[PDB]
Amino acid sequence: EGNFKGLCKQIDHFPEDADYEADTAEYFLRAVRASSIFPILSVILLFMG
Amino acid sequence: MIKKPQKSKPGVFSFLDPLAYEIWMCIVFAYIGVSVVLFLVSRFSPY
Amino acid sequence: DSGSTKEFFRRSKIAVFDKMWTYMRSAEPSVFVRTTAEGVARVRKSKGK
Ligand SMILES: N[C@@H](CCC(=O)O)C(=O)O
């Protein structure tokens, strides 16, 4: 629903102001996020099963 | 003058906000001793 | 630039303020700015630096 429909962007985490690196609980949460790590692993044991 | 901070939210262990860290520590110490007192009275050979 | 505060730390005898002025004379490039909002949006794009 736009001037170009079906243009699929690749998206990751982006560095905003000061990045809150001291929030290592957040940065790790960012690190888990941009990944299919558990939904890919949800395939794995289901495939292995 | 420096930049604004953001509204950096509470974390994972936010739930234990109502108590001091030292209060929780007293609870566990209390938790053990109550059991072993019951382990004293129960199983004491009530012959 | 051409501020009394910029002259104050030149004349300030407090050791931390000296040490700031020791840095501020050695701050490369210019931390010093000519006009007001010049320094403001500089901080606003500094991302806390
Ligand atoms: N009112 C001050 C502003 C600059 C400063 O504080 O250094 C002046 O005219 O010198």
UniProtKB/Swiss-Prot annotation, chain A:
Enumerate the transmembrane spans: 35-49
Q: Which domain of life is it from?
A: Eukaryota
User: Found in which tissues?
Assistant: Brain.
- What are the subcellular locations of this protein? Membrane; Synapse, Synaptosome
Q: How does it assemble?
A: The L-type calcium channel is composed of five subunits: alpha-1, alpha-2/delta, beta and gamma. Interacts with the PDZ domains of DLG4/PSD-95 and DLG1/SAP97. May interact with GOPC. Acts as an auxiliary subunit for AMPA-selective glutamate receptors (AMPARs). Found in a complex with GRIA1, GRIA2, GRIA3, GRIA4, CNIH2, CNIH3, CACNG3, CACNG4, CACNG5, CACNG7 and CACNG8. Interacts with GRIA1 and GRIA2. Interacts with MPP2.
Family in the record: Belongs to the PMP-22/EMP/MP20 family. CACNG subfamily.
Functionally, this protein is described as follows: Regulates the trafficking and gating properties of AMPA-selective glutamate receptors (AMPARs). Promotes their targeting to the cell membrane and synapses and modulates their gating properties by slowing their rates of activation, deactivation and desensitization. Does not show subunit-specific AMPA receptor regulation and regulates all AMPAR subunits. Thought to stabilize the calcium channel in an inactivated (closed) state.
Disorder association: Defects in Cacng2 cause the stargazer (stg) phenotype. Stg mice have spike-wave seizures characteristic of absence epilepsy, with accompanying defects in the cerebellum and inner ear.
Annotated protein name in UniProt: Voltage-dependent calcium channel gamma-2 subunit
Give the encoding gene's name: Cacng2
Q: Span of the full-length protein shown?
A: 70 to 118 of 323
UniProtKB/Swiss-Prot annotation, chain B:
Q: What do we know about what induces or represses this protein's expression?
A: Down-regulated in the pyramidal cell layer of CA1 in the hippocampus by global ischemia.
> How is expression of this protein distributed across tissues?
Detected in forebrain. Detected in dendrites of neuronal cells. Expressed in the pyramidal cell layers of CA1 and CA3 and in the granule cell layer of the dentate gyrus.
Instruction: Fill in the PTM field for this protein.
Output: Palmitoylated. Depalmitoylated upon L-glutamate stimulation. Ubiquitinated by RNF167, leading to its degradation.
Compartment(s) of residence = Cell membrane; Postsynaptic cell membrane; Postsynaptic density membrane
Transmembrane regions: 21-41
Entry similarity comment: Belongs to the glutamate-gated ion channel (TC 1.A.10.1) family. GRIA2 subfamily.
Domains (record comment): The M4 transmembrane segment mediates tetramerization and is required for cell surface expression.
Q: What more does the entry say?
A: The postsynaptic actions of L-glutamate are mediated by a variety of receptors that are named according to their selective agonists. This receptor binds AMPA (quisqualate) > L-glutamate > kainate.
Q: How does it assemble?
A: Homotetramer or heterotetramer of pore-forming glutamate receptor subunits. Tetramers may be formed by the dimerization of dimers. May interact with MPP4. Forms a ternary complex with GRIP1 and CSPG4. Interacts with ATAD1 in an ATP-dependent manner. ATAD1-catalyzed ATP hydrolysis disrupts binding to ATAD1 and to GRIP1 and leads to AMPAR complex disassembly. Interacts with GRIP2. Interacts with GRIP1. Interacts with NSF via its C-terminus. Interacts with CACNG2, PICK1 and GRIP2. Interacts with GRIA1 and SYNDIG1. Part of a complex containing GRIA2, NSF and NAPA and/or NAPB.
Q: What does this protein do?
A: Ionotropic glutamate receptor that functions as a ligand-gated cation channel, gated by L-glutamate and glutamatergic agonists such as alpha-amino-3-hydroxy-5-methyl-4-isoxazolepropionic acid (AMPA), quisqualic acid, and kainic acid. L-glutamate acts as an excitatory neurotransmitter at many synapses in the central nervous system and plays an important role in fast excitatory synaptic transmission.
Which protein are we looking at? Glutamate receptor 2
